[PDB]
Amino acid sequence: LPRGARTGAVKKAWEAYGVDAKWKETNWAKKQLQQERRQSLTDFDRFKVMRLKKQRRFEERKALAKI
């Protein structure tokens, strides 16, 4: 990136390097995506979360007793 590059040069560098793609792969955006899915959970959706975590942990408890 040159110093003092205007909006045209920075836009062409963003598209060439594809920094929208590598931002999505960053651990910070995965954290930001997960926490956005927190707040979108409705009351019914939070109940299915409780039910499926119960179903998931039944296997994880079983495997831990095996280990």
């Binding site: 707040q39 979108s40 959970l41 409705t42 009351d43 019914f44 109940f47 299915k48 039910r51």
Partner: protein
């Protein structure tokens, strides 16, 4: 009337306050799952059948899922949720019949001798029991179609650690 007015009790001024209908909130659509906040059915997850006049809502459980019968509740005493169960197949004519306000509103030896005694709890009417069954039979069939909706309506809402209602969405 019959009596000439015996005292200086004056008739009131003509009051210009006209009764205009109550517009409910946009969330209060028929089929919306509600959360009861007060009463003996506090914390129960019910469904809304029809929005009635002056801020009250007609509500059923259904009775075979959680245990709340055909009841009226106040709109302000209810949290409305985003989940809506299909009303297809539910008799609208029976809903209009139970929406009538009289459906829920309504000296001797025996009179003296039950004084001070707790009156026995009245067993349920056969008309109300049959009216419940004619409504919930299509509701429950629609409820069974969507996964985990029946267990969701059987369960009770509760607040846990860190649950902030000013950010939670229903």
């Amino acid at each position: 009337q019959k009596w000439y007015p015996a005292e200086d009790e004056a008739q009131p001024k003509k009051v210009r306050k006209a009764v205009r209908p109550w517009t409910p909130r946009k969330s209060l659509q028929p089929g919306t799952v509600l959360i009861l906040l007060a009463g003996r059915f506090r914390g129960k997850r019910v469904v809304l059948l029809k929005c009635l006049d002056q801020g009250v809502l007609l509500v059923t459980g259904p009775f075979k899922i959680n245990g709340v019968p055909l009841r009226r509740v106040n709109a302000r005493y209810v949290i409305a949720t985003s989940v809506k169960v299909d009303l297809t197949g539910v008799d609208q004519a029976k809903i209009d019949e139970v929406a009538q306000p009289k459906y829920f509103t309504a000296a001797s030896e025996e009179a003296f001798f039950k004084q001070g005694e707790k009156p026995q709890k009245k067993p349920v009417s056969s008309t109300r029991a049959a009216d419940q069954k004619a409504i919930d039979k299509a509701l429950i069939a629609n409820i069974k179609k969507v996964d985990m909706l029946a267990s969701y309506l059987a369960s009770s809402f509760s607040l846990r650690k860190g649950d902030k209602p000013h950010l939670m969405k229903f």
